[PDB]
Amino acid sequence: QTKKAAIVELLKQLELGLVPYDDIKQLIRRELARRLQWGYKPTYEEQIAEIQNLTHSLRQMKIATEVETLDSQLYEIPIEFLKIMNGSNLKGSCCYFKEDSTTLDEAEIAMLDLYCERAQIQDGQSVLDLGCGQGALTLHVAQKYKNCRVTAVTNSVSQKEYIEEESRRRNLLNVEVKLADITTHEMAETYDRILVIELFEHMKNYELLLRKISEWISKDGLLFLEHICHKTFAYHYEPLDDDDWFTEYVFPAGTMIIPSASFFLYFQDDVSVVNHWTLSGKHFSRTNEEWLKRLDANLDVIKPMFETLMGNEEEAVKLINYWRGFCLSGMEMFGYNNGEEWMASHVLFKK
Amino acid sequence: QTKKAAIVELLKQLELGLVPYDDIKQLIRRELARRLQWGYKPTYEEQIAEIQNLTHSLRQMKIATEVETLDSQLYEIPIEFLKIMNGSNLKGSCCYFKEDSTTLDEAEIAMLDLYCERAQIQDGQSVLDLGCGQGALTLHVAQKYKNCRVTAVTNSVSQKEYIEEESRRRNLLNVEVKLADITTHEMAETYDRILVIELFEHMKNYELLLRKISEWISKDGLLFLEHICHKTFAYHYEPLDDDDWFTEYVFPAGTMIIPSASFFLYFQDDVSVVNHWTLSGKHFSRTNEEWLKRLDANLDVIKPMFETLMGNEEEAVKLINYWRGFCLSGMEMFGYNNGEEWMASHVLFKK
Ligand SMILES: Nc1ncnc2c1ncn2[C@@H]1O[C@H](CSCC[C@H](N)C(=O)O)[C@@H](O)[C@H]1O
Ligand SMILES: Nc1ncnc2c1ncn2[C@@H]1O[C@H](CSCC[C@H](N)C(=O)O)[C@@H](O)[C@H]1O
Ligand SMILES: COc1cc2c(cc1OC)CC(=O)NC2
Ligand SMILES: COc1cc2c(cc1OC)CC(=O)NC2
């Protein structure tokens, strides 16, 4: 009764930044632990059954609902704010920290290099970057492979822009950006290597999506895929119950899906898995931590920025405290259990 | 829908010189890449079948179409403009760059020397130069082959000009020039060596043309031909689709043909191939590059020249940017993939 009110009192305290970081982390692990209790099953038969029920149900849905409440709540973020929170490459995804001494910028370059290595991109190929974001991978591949023909795809208007100027500003011609919704977009072109970095989490019907992406692959071409995940169970990001405030704490309802590490192994109707890697949840946990440090370290420039974009300081506070919850959610979630619960997954496909 | 209108806007920007060189080359490579995908075939059978479709279709057309409307939009250029863009010999065709420090003038001489070598021109012979242009080849062969008797043929009153005066301005006997349309011209004289440098690209029925040219060959005489090409497929210079702006960007519609390197091996009804060479596309690429440099470097003299030729500044701007797009298309097309796609071909025929 009143602990639903207690829940709607916690969220207000978080919106007003009244709750210390440690207390936030503590409350998060509680909901994380409750998630694991909900996810894990007593027998392995039930565990595999749960993965089957989810894979079968998604094949009845559309490629994606959520599609234009999409990135108005998210991804349509002003570029001037991302250059403060993110690294030099503006990578809005997981970064790779090999040593404790690894900076955010170094971590960004690490993942990008590992992408080219596991996707096996060579100097004379045509590359496709679905959900390119701010073009962290596009600009990186374009410069490192002068004879490549990278093509970035986005449904975001300001994401399509920053790439097109920063590509020309960096002396790059290989770069090409298209404005389209991958859910309903069709193209008669074909590429040697298709790169998808944390895009499927937003989709639903993976059979239809992979069927569409498969047709864009050149023969002897390869499809590389990264997606954050749990190592065992998968599930829609819908609240566990009355007390679950953490699920919809950052991402809007019905916009997220957390696959198991073996999830896309059950979607090989048009593609065939060649190689499969996982990656410690620490890498993303540290990534959000470095993002969090840059927010607090630059509140002097971020605050007036949010005041200008908003209309009042009140909602300028709710916004800065949202991006804190964003970083904090990523920190404690992927760093949970020594980063051996929620983590990243790399899959390499062929035609 | 809006992609058709997006193209006409681009063409207008190019006319008014509002698009930087790098975005132009980038947009060209995209179309170039699109033509390669359209040209290359998955099976060699279909690749050979395409060559046969074009070779057979040409044997029904007339020798040439759009004959004097090709003489109007092009090849009737004021001589004082060519002196600035072209080299010393005014060679309106591919030049030969042996090493990186080769000048334009050196390149013009390099090709001309290579012509006499592969044509095996010797002092006491009668030479015919079909499509002489500004007589870069005629004057060259005429000078230090004093006992030769060069004869230039042109349908351009402007080209029949410069040669004659600049032939006795250098004190030359051999040079003799004719004004006629090769498409319809008959002649009862016969030569020891006929030289055709990039003329067949404007023609259609090669069987009828080579049948006529062969009649002008003295027995034990030779026919040397140079033609730009692609190493594999051939095609009319017509738009791929409505999104293909590059095809009719430089040359007027229906006035161009891009032969295969092996194309004129299929037209040996009256002539017989003796030798066959190709030549890297980097040669003509650098050639158009040197031409482009000479344009921008002499805009202080070129502009007032175009203002005088035209009637207003608006059309003067359109014209200079045309020759810019002329050289830009030449650079990227022949320089594409290290010049191993579109290139030049040399063929030596006997009767
Ligand atoms: N329905 C949709 N259609 C096209 N792009 C979408 C999409 N839904 C999400 N995206 C894009 O996919 C990206 C996922 S976030 C990943 C960004 C980028 N790949 C990086 O690593 O930095 C977002 O930038 C968003 O713009
Ligand atoms: N139908 C036609 N009849 C006679 N000459 C033609 C012709 N169509 C094109 N030409 C000539 O062929 C030339 C092709 S451009 C090549 C010019 C010269 N051979 C050089 O290498 O520099 C043009 O100068 C043009 O005047
Ligand atoms: C809140 O941490 C997350 C960050 C990101 C994703 C998921 C996150 O939490 C599960 C996936 C994504 O599309 N972008 C980055
Ligand atoms: C635009 O580059 C070209 C230049 C020339 C030709 C073709 C070109 O492009 C294919 C052939 C010709 O008759 N004259 C020169």
Q: For B60-113, give the DSSP string.
A: TS-S-SSTTTHHHHSS---HHHHHHHS-SS---S-----STT--HHHHHHHHHH
Partners of residue A177 on adjacent β-strands: A152
Give residues with Cβ within 8 angstroms of B40, minimum separation 6.
Answer: B47, B232, B233
B195, B168 contact by CB (below 8 A) = no
Cα B213 to Cα A280, B115, B174, B180, B210: the distances in Å are 75, 18, 21, 14, 5
What is the experimental method? Answer: X-ray
Distance of CA B105 to the CA centre of its chain: 18
Q: How far is CA A10 from the centre of its chain?
A: 26
Determine whether the interchain pair A149/B26 forms a contact, defined as Cβ–Cβ distance below 8 Å: no
- At residue B179, φ and ψ (nearest 5 deg) are -110, 105
Q: Kindly state the tokens that stand for B214.
A: 């062969």
- Is A107 exposed, middle or buried (CB count within 10 Å of its CB: 0-12, 13-18, 19+)? buried
Q: In chain B, which ranges are continuous DSSP H helix? A: 2-15, 21-39, 44-58, 70-73, 79-85, 104-119, 136-143, 157-168, 206-215, 282-297, 299-309, 313-335
Output the six-digit token pair for B243.
């999104």
CA of A198 from ligand 1 middle (Å) equals 7
CA of B340 relative to ligand 1 center, distance in Å:
37
Distance of CA B71 to the CA centre of its chain: 13
Q: What is the rounded CA–CA span in Å between residue B152 and residue B236?
A: 28
From the list B95, B116, B229, B327, the catalytic residue is B327
Residue B262: both structure tokens together: 């092996």
Residue A197, φ and ψ in degrees, nearest 5: -115, 100
Task: Show the CA angle centred on residue B185, arms to residues B181 and B187, nearest 5°.
Answer: 140
Interface of B with A (CB under 8 A): 22-23, 25-26, 29-30, 33, 37
CA distance A9 to B340: 69
Element (H, E) at B16: none
DSSP class of residue B252?
P
How close is the nearest chain A Cα to the Cα of B12, in Å?
A: 21
Cβ within 8 Å, pair A173-B33 = no
Q: What SS3 class is residue B199?
A: coil
Q: Write down how long chain B is.
A: 351
Q: What H or E segment, with its residue span, contains residue A167? A: helix A157-168
Q: Which two tokens stand for residue A154?
A: 């986005």
User: Residue A44 CA to chain centroid, in angstroms?
Assistant: 29
Tell me the best of A65, A75, A153, A283 to mutate to test the pocket of ligand 1, counting ligand atoms within 8 Å of each CB and taking the most.
A75
Closest CA–CA distance from residue A173 to any residue of chain B (Å): 6
B167 token code pair: 């032939």
**Measured from the CA of A155, which atom of ligand 1 is nearest?**
4
Distance of alpha carbon A153 from alpha carbon A194, whole angstroms:
11
A2: Cβ contacts below 8 Å, ≥ 6 apart = none
Resolution in Å equals 2.8
Give residue A78's identity as a one-letter amino acid code: P
Strand A127-130 to A191-197 pairing: parallel
Chain A residues with a Cβ under 8 Å from any Cβ in chain B: 126, 149, 168, 173, 176, 190
- Longest Cα separation, chain A: 63
**A294 CA distance to ligand 1 middle (Å):** 22
Pairing of strands A342-350, A217-230: antiparallel
- Contact between B87 and B140 under an 8 Å Cβ cutoff? The reply is no
What whole-number distance in Å separates Cα of residue B349 and Cα of residue A49?
A: 76
The residue of chain A with its CA nearest to that of B338 is A147
| Whether the Cβ atoms of residue B282 and residue B335 lie closer than 8 Å to each other | yes
User: Beta strands A217-230 and A191-197: pairing type?
Assistant: parallel
Phi (first) and psi of residue A269, to 5 degrees: -75, -25
Give the separation between CA B33 and CA B54, rounded to whole angstroms: 22
- For residue A200, what is the DSSP state? G
Q: What residues of chain A lie within 8 A of the CB of B26, using their CB? A: 173, 176
Specify whether the CB–CB gap between A233 and A37 falls below 8 A. no
Cβ–Cβ gap A176/B30 under 8 Å: yes
Segment holding B151, helix H or strand E: strand B151-154
- B345, B262, B333: which is closest to B34 by C-alpha? B333
Nearest atom in ligand 1 to the alpha carbon of residue A67 is 1
Q: How far is CA A161 from CA A87, A155, A183, B26, in A?
A: 18, 11, 21, 17
- The response to whether A133 counts as a known ligand-binding position is yes
Assigned token pair, B113 = 């020397």
CB-closest option in B22, B23, B33 to A149: B33
Whole-number Å distance between alpha carbons of A149 and A193:
10
Helix, strand, coil tally for chain A in percent (to 5) = 45, 15, 40
Q: How far apart are the C-alpha atoms of B135 and A96, rounded to whole Å?
A: 65
Query: What is d(CA A306, CA A317) in angstroms, rounded to the nearest whole number?
Result: 8
Nearest ligand for residue A82 CA: 1
DSSP string, A60-102: TS-S-S-TTTTTTTTT---HHHHHHHS-SS---S-----STT-
Tell me how far apart the alpha carbons of residues B280 and B268 are, in angstroms, rounded to a whole number.
25
